[PDB]
């Protein structure tokens, strides 16, 4: 394990305060919030400055002391746990928020600043910051750079790679590559910025960047609709698509059975007459008073082509809510269900009616009577493609099948030419599935530039590559 | 010089109709329209497939034969010129459009595609392909990528880089990285996509890529704005930005100076009734027919702050041309008013005021009776800050104070925290400047990231580091 010289050494360069040794304390940091895996550590560091991560990686490059950079440890790939005597690098400290710039339209933050915070922030000068995401109130910057967070508004918005347009590194062997940045336009030189966004920690530690703000919408419009197929639902995209551009920011398919869940199990108000097999959640925002006009136009083209059944424009900001409650509320609803084995992909938008149709048919015909339960953000083609247990079974019979199911379902990602991982990485969990999947020559680049930029192998060494 | 044994075997891999060694077929591809290098090569090779790009790198790296990639041969920076005896990879013949995809909005063309080609295929499906420069009719895709080309309407859809999805890659040692995707949500290990947008051809040969597609406007709305100053133009930008959002595709700002050369020189109708020290040129697309509502809504703004001092909407298409026209000339309309010393940068856009401020009076200090000629996209910072001789001078003994004035001017860049490279990239004629300029340990990463994809420096060495 870690010698007592070096826990020494660690402690000194951040306080004994802001060094954590004592299992209570280590709790909260080797395990996390769905508990997917239990690792263990010998110690925490919770830095305060740039300044002190650096010393704590010239030492650990030194001493071959392994470490593992955490944010706000919401990541659901074991990306952040120590999982063999790591010393955990928490950022959680490094929360400032430097700089709003209002003009630049930028804003310089610390890695570890919570992004409902920024959001906050932004808001309250007149901006927007758009990274929304599911764990906003705990995930960091760091985190959502690091992973390369995208949310439901990613098909207006971008991902967390769009936001960024600078990035301070402190790499493992003690060096700062500070690009920190207000520039929109800039060439000159290679782009390593977005080397490390996604890179999962495996090729340094973030500790500030700067990102993009946005002008705050004036009106926000949002209904649901009921459709036949998800099919319908794209060609309902394609009209939103062209009558609404950049103003379309939100986009969800939700099939009947998640729909269901959520209606009663999270008390949510069922939002058509009817029950409809598909259902889409369409939300337009704009900078003028214009958002409502697009959303019936919309609307209309879809009655007209027959792919839209019936419609409910929220009326109040209550109503609006409510409408977001049923979506937001999905993941939970499950839980009573019984087992749900998860998992999140993508696919080119138009496979995504192919996707669904061929993962549910390959799925029920390897667990008869299984409940996919399918959602998720048709602009970007990525889906929440969840399967419950079978009415009856039992629930640790069925999540043994999680391997199996995988199998059934990447064959189907893979054949559409998807993506097994569309937003929360790769870290330790599909580093396998990784190097069967990924072009040959790019995973030889990928462990080329590790080795590069973490020779002796301690900059959250097992994950990624 | 390169021997007739390895003469042949390049011969004979692309056949000899693609091979040219006459002196007067490679003029074409030694030297650039604005003849700021003249170079020299012994070979120039048109490859059609990728396959024949792979038998090129494979035989080059073997035998220690430099490369240099080149697409439209319209870089500004020297970087697809051969100084050195090296073999021109031209990628022109690789100019198939291979799949449009109108619902996933993507769209597959190889590195030669010429960009206004595929601006046409785009609009002929009812989409548009937003990427847009001045050497269109000459610049591929190819080019764009590696150079990282951004236009007027960049503060809008953004960057060359932005427009990608995925791209295909052939390296120095023959391998291939196939990134082709169509995927817009893909965590799968790093980002090596961007590593090679902004290359310059000194990474490898780009040879196919997968672009974004976007909705295609409905309604275009121009309007041409009198100013007092810089300042006052981004108090515009900024009620420009809330009201319109993504809706504003071009804001342009220009000096009287220039709009004056154009009037006089290039036969352009003076949009205005009175002479003003600033002006803007502002567009705004939208999906619906609601762009005049907003451009009417900002201007109106603007008058009531005082900003704006007189305004003119184009009524018709006619009109709007006449607008750009003027515009898009500014560059030629210079040639006629003496030598011009000529600087593509970028700064903060909040600093634009301050940049325009300083430059011209460090320029005037320098060069007294010197004209500034300034012009750009202030949306996104980047000026064109070029100045003219003074009225009456030797142009020779003018332009020779071309790197006193870059010493001047890249003293007001790096102040403000700019670029010296705003678009055009660095290739051969910033390389030094850059090593002065970067980050330290940002250029320590690209030389050894150099090293690691071309260990033999065969591709395009001397360029960017
Ligand atoms: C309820 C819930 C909803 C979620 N919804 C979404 C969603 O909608 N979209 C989405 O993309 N993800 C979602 N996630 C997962 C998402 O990846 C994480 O929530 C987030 O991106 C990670 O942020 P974090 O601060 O928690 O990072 P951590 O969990 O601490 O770390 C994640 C990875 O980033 C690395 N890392 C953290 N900080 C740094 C740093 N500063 N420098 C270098 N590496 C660092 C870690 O080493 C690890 O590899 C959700 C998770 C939960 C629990
Ligand atoms: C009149 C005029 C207006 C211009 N306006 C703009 C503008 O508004 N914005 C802007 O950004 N630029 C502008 N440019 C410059 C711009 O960089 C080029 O026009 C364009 O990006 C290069 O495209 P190309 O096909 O001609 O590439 P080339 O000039 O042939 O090559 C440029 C660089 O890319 C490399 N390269 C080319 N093809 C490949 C390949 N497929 N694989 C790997 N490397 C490759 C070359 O080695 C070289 O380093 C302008 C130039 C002119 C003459």
Not at 185 to 211: M, V, W
Request: hydrophobic share 40%; glycine share 10%; net charge negative.
């Amino acid at each position: 394990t870690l010698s007592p010289e070096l826990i020494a050494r660690f402690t000194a360069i951040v306080g004994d305060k802001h060094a954590l040794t004592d299992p209570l304390e280590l709790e909260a940091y080797i395990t996390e919030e769905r508990n997917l895996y239990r690792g263990h550590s010998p110690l925490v560091l919770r830095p305060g400055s740039t300044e002190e991560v650096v010393a704590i990686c010239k030492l650990a490059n030194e001493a071959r002391v392994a470490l593992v950079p955490q944010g706000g440890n919401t990541g659901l790939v074991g990306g952040q746990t120590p999982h063999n005597g790591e010393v955990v690098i928490s950022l959680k400290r490094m929360d400032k928020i430097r700089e709003i710039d209002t003009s630049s339209n930028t804003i310089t933050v610390e890695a570890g600043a919570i992004l409902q915070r920024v959001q906050e922030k932004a808001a309250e000068v007149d901006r927007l910051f758009p990274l929304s995401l599911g764990a906003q109130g705990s995930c960091t910057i760091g985190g959502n750079l690091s992973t390369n967070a995208g949310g439901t508004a990613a098909l207006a918005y971008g991902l967390a790679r769009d936001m960024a347009l600078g990035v301070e590194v402190v790499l493992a062997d003690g060096r700062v590559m500070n690009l920190l940045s207000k520039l929109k336009k800039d060439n000159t030189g290679y782009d390593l910025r977005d080397l490390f966004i996604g890179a999962e920690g495996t090729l340094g530690i973030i500790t500030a960047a700067t990102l993009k703000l946005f002008p705050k919408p004036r009106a926000v419009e949002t209904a649901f609709v009921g459709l036949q197929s998800p099919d319908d639902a794209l060609k309902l995209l394609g009209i939103a698509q062209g009558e609404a551009a950049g103003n379309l920011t939100s986009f969800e398919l939700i099939a009947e059975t998640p729909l269901d869940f959520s209606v009663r199990h999270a008390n949510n108000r069922d939002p058509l007459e009817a029950r409809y097999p598909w259902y889409v959640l369409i939300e337009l925002s704009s900078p003028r008073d214009d958002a409502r006009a697009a959303l019936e136009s919309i609307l209309e083209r879809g009655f007209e082509d027959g792919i839209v059944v019936d419609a409910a424009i929220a009326n109040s900001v209550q109503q609006q809510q409510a409408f977001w409650k049923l979506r937001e509320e999905i993941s939970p609803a499950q839980k009573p269900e019984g087992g749900s084995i998860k998992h999140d992909i993508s696919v080119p938008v138009a496979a995504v009616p192919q996707f669904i149709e061929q993962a549910n048919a390959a799925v029920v015909a390897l667990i008869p009577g299984a409940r996919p339960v399918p959602f998720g953000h048709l602009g970007d083609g990525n889906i929440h493609y969840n399967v419950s247990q079978p009415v009856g079974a039992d629930k640790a019979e069925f999540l043994a099948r999680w391997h199996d199911v995988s199998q059934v379902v990447f064959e189907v990602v893979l054949r559409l030419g998807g993506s097994i991982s569309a937003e929360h990485g790769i870290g330790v969990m599909k580093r396998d599935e990784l190097a069967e999947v990924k072009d040959k020559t790019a995973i030889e680049l990928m462990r080329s530039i590790k080795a590069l930029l973490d020779p002796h192998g301690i900059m959250n060494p097992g994950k990624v590559v």
